mmCIF file of C-alpha atoms in Angstrom:
data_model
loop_
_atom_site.group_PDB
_atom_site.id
_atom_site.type_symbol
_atom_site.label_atom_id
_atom_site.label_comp_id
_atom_site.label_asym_id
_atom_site.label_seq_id
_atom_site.Cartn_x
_atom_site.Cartn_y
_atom_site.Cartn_z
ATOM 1 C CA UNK A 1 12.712 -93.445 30.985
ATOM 2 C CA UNK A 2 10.858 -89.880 30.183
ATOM 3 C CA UNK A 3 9.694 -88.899 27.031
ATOM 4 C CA UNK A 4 11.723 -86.320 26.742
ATOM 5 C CA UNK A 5 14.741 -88.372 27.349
ATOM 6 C CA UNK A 6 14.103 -90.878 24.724
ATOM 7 C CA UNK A 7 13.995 -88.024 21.706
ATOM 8 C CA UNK A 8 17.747 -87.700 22.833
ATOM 9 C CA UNK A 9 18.972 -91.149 23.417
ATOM 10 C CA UNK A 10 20.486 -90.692 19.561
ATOM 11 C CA UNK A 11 21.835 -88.677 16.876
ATOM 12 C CA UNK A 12 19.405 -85.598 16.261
ATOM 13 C CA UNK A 13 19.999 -83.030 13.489
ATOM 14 C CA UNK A 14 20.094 -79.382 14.690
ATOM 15 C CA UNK A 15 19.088 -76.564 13.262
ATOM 16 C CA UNK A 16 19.626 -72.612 14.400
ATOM 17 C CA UNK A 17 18.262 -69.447 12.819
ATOM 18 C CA UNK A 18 19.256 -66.173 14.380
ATOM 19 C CA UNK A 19 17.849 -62.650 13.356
ATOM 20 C CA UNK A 20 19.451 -59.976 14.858
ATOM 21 C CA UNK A 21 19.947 -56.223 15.240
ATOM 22 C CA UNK A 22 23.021 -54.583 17.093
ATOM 23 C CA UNK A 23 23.239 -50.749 16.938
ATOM 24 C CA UNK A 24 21.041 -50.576 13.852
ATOM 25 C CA UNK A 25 23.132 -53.211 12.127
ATOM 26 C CA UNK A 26 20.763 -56.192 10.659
ATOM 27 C CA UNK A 27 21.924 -59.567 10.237
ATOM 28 C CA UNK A 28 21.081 -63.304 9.759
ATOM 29 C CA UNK A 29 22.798 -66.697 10.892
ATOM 30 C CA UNK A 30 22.184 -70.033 10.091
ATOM 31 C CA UNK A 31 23.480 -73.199 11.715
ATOM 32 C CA UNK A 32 23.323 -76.636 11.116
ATOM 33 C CA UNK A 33 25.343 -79.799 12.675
ATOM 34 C CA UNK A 34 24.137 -82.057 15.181
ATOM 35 C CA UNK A 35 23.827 -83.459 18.836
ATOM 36 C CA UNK A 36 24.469 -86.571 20.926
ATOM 37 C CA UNK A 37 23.248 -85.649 24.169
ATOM 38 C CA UNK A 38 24.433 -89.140 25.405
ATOM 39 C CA UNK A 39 28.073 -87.633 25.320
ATOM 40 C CA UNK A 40 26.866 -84.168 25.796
ATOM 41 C CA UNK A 41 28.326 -83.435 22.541
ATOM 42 C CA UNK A 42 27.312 -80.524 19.644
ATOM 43 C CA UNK A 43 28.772 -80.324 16.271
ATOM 44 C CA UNK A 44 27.667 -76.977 14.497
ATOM 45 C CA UNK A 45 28.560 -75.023 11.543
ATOM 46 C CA UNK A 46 27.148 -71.331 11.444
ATOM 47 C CA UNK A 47 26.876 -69.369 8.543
ATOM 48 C CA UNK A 48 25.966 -65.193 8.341
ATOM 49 C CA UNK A 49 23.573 -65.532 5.622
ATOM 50 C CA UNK A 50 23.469 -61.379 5.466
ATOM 51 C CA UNK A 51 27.430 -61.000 4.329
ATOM 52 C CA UNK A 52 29.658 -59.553 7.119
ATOM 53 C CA UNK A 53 28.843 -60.091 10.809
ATOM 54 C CA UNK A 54 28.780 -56.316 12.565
ATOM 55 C CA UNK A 55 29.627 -58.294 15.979
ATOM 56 C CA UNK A 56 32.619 -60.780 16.654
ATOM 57 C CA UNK A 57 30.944 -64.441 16.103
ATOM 58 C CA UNK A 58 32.042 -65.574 20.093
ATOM 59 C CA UNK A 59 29.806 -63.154 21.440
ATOM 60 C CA UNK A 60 27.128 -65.414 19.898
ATOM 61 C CA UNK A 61 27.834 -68.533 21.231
ATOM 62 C CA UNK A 62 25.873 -68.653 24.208
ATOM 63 C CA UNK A 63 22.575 -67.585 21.789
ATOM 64 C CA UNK A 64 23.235 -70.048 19.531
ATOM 65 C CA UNK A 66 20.394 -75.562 22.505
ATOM 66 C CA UNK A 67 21.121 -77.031 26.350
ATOM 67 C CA UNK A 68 18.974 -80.368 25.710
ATOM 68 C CA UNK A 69 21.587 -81.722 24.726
ATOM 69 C CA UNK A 70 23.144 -81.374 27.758
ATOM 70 C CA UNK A 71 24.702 -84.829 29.617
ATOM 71 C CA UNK A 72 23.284 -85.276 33.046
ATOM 72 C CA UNK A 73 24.656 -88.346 34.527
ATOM 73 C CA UNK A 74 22.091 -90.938 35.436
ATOM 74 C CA UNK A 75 22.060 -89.652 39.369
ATOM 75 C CA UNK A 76 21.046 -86.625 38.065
ATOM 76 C CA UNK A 77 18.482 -87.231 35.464
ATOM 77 C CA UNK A 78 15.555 -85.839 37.674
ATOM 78 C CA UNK A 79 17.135 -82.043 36.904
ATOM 79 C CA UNK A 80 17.130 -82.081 33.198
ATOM 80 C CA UNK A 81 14.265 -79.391 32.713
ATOM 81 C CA UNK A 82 15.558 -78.665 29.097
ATOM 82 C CA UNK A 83 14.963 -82.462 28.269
ATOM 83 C CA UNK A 84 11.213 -82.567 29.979
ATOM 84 C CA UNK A 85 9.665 -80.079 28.450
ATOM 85 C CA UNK A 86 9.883 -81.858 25.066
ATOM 86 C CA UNK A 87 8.968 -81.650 21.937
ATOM 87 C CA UNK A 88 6.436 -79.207 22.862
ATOM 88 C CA UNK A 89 9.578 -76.695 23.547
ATOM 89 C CA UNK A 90 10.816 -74.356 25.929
ATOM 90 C CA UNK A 91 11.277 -70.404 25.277
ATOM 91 C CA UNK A 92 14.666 -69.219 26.146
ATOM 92 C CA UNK A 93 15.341 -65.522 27.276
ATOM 93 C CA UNK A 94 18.495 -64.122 28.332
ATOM 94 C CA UNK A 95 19.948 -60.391 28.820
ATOM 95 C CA UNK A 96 23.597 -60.695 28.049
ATOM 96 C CA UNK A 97 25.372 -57.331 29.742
ATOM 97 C CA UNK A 98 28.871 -56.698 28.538
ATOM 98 C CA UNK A 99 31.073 -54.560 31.422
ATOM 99 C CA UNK A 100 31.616 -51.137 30.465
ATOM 100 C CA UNK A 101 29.673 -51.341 26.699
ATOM 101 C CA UNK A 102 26.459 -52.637 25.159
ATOM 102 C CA UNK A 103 23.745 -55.372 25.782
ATOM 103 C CA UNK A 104 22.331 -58.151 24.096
ATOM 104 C CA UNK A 105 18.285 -59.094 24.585
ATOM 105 C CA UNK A 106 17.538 -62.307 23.149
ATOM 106 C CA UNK A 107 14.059 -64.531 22.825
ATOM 107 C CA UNK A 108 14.373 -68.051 21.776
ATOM 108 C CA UNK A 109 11.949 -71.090 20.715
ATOM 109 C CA UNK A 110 13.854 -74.432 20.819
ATOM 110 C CA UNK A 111 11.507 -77.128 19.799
ATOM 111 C CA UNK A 112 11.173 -80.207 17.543
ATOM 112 C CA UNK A 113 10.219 -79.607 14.024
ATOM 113 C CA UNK A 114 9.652 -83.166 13.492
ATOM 114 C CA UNK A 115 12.928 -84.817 13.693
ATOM 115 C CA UNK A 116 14.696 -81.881 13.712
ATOM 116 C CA UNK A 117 15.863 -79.670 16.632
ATOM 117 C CA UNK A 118 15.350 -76.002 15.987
ATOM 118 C CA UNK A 119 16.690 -72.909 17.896
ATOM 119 C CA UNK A 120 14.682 -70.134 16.530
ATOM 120 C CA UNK A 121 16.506 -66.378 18.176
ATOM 121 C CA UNK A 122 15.587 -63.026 17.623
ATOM 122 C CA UNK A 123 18.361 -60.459 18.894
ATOM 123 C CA UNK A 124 18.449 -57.014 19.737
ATOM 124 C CA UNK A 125 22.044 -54.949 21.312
ATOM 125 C CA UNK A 126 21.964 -51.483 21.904
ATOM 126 C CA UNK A 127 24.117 -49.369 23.916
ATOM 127 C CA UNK A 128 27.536 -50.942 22.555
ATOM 128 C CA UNK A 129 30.694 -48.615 21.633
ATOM 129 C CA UNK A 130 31.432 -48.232 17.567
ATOM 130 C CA UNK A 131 35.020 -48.485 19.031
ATOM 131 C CA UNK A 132 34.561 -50.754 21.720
ATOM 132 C CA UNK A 133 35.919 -54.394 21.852
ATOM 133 C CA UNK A 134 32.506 -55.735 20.019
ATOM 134 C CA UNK A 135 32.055 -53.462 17.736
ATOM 135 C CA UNK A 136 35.299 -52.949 17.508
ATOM 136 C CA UNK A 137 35.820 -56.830 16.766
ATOM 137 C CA UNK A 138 38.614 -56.364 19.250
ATOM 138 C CA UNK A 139 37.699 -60.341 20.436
ATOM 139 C CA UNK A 140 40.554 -63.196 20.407
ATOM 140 C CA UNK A 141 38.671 -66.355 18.150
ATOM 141 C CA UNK A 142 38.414 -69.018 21.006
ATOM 142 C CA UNK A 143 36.055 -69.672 23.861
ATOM 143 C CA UNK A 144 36.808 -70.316 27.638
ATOM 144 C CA UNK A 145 34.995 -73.327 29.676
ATOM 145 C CA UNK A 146 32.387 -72.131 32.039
ATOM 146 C CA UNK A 147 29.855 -73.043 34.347
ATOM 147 C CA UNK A 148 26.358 -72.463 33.960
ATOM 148 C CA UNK A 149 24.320 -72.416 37.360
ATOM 149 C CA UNK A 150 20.515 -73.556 37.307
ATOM 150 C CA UNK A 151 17.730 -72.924 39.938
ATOM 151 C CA UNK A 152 14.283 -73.971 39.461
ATOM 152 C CA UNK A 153 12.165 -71.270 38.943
ATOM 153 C CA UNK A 154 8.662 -72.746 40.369
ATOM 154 C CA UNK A 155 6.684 -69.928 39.763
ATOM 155 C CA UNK A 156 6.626 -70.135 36.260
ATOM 156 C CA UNK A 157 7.304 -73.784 35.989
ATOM 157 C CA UNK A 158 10.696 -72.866 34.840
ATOM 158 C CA UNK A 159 14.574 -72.513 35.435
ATOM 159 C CA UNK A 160 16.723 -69.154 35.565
ATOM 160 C CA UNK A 161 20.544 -69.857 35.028
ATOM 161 C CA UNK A 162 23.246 -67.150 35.635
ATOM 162 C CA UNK A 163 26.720 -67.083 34.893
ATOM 163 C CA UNK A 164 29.716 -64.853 33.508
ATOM 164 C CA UNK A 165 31.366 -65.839 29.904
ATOM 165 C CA UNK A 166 34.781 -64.543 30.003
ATOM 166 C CA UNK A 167 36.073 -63.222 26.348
ATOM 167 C CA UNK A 168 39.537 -62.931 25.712
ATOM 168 C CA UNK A 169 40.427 -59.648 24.589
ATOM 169 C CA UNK A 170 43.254 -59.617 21.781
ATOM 170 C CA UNK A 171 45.518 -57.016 24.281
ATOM 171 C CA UNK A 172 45.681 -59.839 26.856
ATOM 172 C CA UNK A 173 42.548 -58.924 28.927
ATOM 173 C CA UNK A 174 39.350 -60.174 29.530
ATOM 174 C CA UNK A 175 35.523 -58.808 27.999
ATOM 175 C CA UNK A 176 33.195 -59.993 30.872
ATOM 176 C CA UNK A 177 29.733 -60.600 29.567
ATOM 177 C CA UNK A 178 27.181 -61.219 32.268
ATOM 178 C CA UNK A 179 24.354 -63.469 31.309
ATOM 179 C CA UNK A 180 20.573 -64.032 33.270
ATOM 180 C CA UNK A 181 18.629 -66.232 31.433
ATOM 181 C CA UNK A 182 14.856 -67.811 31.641
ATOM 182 C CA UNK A 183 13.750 -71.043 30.577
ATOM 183 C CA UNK A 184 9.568 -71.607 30.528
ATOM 184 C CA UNK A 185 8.080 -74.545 28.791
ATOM 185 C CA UNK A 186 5.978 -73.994 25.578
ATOM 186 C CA UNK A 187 3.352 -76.532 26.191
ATOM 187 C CA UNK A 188 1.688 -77.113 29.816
ATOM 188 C CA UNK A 189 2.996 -80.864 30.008
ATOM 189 C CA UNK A 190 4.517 -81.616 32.848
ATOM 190 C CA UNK A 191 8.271 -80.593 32.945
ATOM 191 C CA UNK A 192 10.884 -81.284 35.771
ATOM 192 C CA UNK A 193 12.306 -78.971 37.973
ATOM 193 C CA UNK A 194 15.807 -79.314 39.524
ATOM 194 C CA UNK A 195 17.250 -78.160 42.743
ATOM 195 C CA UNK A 196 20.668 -75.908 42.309
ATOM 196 C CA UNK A 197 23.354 -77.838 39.557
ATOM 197 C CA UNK A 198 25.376 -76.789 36.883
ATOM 198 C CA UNK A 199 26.138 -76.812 33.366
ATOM 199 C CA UNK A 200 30.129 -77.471 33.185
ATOM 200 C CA UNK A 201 30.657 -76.606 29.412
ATOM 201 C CA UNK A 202 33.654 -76.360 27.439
ATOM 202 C CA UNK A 203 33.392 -75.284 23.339
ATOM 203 C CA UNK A 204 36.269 -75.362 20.768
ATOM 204 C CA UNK A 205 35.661 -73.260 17.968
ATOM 205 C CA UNK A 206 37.309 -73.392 14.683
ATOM 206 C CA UNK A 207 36.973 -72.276 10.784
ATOM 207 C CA UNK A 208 36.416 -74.453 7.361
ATOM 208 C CA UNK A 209 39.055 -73.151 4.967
ATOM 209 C CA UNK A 210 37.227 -73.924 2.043
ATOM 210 C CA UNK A 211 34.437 -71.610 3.388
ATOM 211 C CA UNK A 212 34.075 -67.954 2.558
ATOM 212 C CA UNK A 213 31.080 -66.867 3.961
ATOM 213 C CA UNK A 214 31.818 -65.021 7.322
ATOM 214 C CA UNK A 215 31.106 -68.314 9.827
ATOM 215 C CA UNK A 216 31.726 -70.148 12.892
ATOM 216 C CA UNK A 217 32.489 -74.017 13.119
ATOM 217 C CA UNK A 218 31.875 -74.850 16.794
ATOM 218 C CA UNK A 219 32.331 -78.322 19.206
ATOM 219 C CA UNK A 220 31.187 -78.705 22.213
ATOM 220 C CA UNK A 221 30.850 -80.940 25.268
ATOM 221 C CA UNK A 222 28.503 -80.155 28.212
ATOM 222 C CA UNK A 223 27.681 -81.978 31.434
ATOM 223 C CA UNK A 224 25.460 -81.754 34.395
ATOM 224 C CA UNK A 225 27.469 -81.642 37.571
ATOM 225 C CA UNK A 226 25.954 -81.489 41.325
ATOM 226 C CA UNK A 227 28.120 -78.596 42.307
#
């Protein structure tokens, strides 16, 4: 059993700070819950700490932790996100949505003691003040997807790619594109996989005792061979 591994064989407390900046418009989020990366399972509830989010809070998602994926005991020898801990990995992703804006995003995800943080900064540009994210044109639920991983040797890394399909509130579909970069933070050694996936679904859902603009998310994610 890794080191890495045994940080997740339990309960660990989560916690997610976003800054970002889309078009000019500033905002915070915060997000605490939990995972059990036994069952592949998150439980999160995100707050914007700044008032009203300027972007619809699904667009976020994939921004705000993929430690806690499953992967099945066959596949244990793949779970770079797991290995590189608690030193940390940096996240980077460019999320391109089709005929509008783009999000750039740098993460740290690392242990802060017990705690497992997902610091973000965020930048968009590009998007349309009439479009379907600024427009907040974007249906309140969340499709299943799969996330593809190849190693990325080179930098001791993974890159992931994959296409998050948003339901549009006229019946169609807001494609955001997503390339993404995973190096470790410390020079440990880390493991990387051959090709797999990341078969993720996510449920999202609202407190009704809350008034602060937020985002109450579950989800389940497993490692699959295919």
């Amino acid at each position: 059993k890794s080191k890495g591994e045994e940080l997740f064989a339990g309960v660990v407390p989560i916690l997610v700070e976003l800054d970002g900046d889309v078009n000019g418009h500033k905002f915070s989020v915060s997000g605490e819950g939990e995972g059990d990366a036994t069952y592949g399972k998150l439980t999160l509830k995100f707050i914007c700490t700044t008032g009203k989010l300027p972007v619809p809070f699904p667009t976020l998602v994939t921004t705000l932790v993929q430690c806690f994926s499953r992967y099945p005991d066959h596949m244990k020898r793949h779970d770079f996100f797991k290995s590189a801990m608690p030193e940390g990995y940096v996240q980077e992703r460019t999320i391109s949505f089709k005929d509008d804006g783009n999000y750039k995003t740098r993460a740290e995800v690392k242990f802060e003691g017990d705690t497992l943080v997902n610091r973000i900064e965020l930048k968009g540009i590009d998007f349309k003040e009439d479009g379907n994210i600024l427009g907040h044109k974007l249906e309140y639920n969340y499709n299943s997807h799969n996330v593809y991983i190849t190693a990325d040797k080179q930098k001791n890394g993974i890159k992931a790619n994959f296409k998050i399909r948003h339901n549009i509130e006229d019946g169609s579909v807001q494609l955001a594109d997503h390339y993404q970069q995973n190096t470790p933070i410390g020079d440990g050694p880390v493991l990387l996989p051959d090709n797999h996936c990341l078969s993720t679904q996510t449920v999202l859902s609202k407190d009704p005792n809350e008034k602060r603009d937020h985002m109450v998310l579950l989800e389940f994610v497993t490692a699959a061979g295919i």
